[PDB]
Structure 1
Amino acid sequence: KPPPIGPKRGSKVKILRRESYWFKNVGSVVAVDQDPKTRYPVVVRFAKVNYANISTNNYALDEVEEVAA
């Protein structure tokens, strides 16, 4: 839909992707690609970097889950 499909910009989100560095770790959604053809729109910004000194990564909608806080 033209309205947002994914989490809100700023919604602290958890990663269900098993192969990511931040698995079972919280994040901070900075953007969600509203194009309904990309596979991993959810641009997250974490607090601590990965082994490649990167704090951001694209994730899917099903590979993400917002916390109750």
Structure 2
Amino acid sequence: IGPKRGSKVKILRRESYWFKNVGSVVAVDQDPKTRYPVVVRFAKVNYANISTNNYALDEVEEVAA
């Protein structure tokens, strides 16, 4: 806590169910390393019975900002 970790993020890929909608996050990755970090989470479910997916900062367009 000091910058911004997981406090409000849209999705922008167009495949991901809650795509353009902004729900809440959690333990976003630490290290330099990989390409699929970030958990996100929101109320609304989706086409599977369980929906709580991980997208990745190449993108999260949050966008402003």
| Gap regions ≥5 residues in structure 1 | none
CA–CA separation in structure 1 for the residues paired with 2:27 and 2:54: 9
Contact kept? 1:6, 1:42, Cα under 8 Å: no
Partner of 2:37: 41
8 Å contact kept, 1:13–1:64: yes
Unaligned runs of 5+ in 2: none
SS at match of 2:26: strand
2:6/2:28 contact within 8 Å kept: no
TM-score normalised by the chain length of structure 2: 0.74
The aligned length equals 65
Indicate the structure with greater strand content. Answer: 1
Q: CA RMSD in A?
A: 3.1
Identity percentage over the alignment? 100
CA deviation digits over 1:14-47, x for unaligned, max 9?
A: 0001111011111201120213222111110111
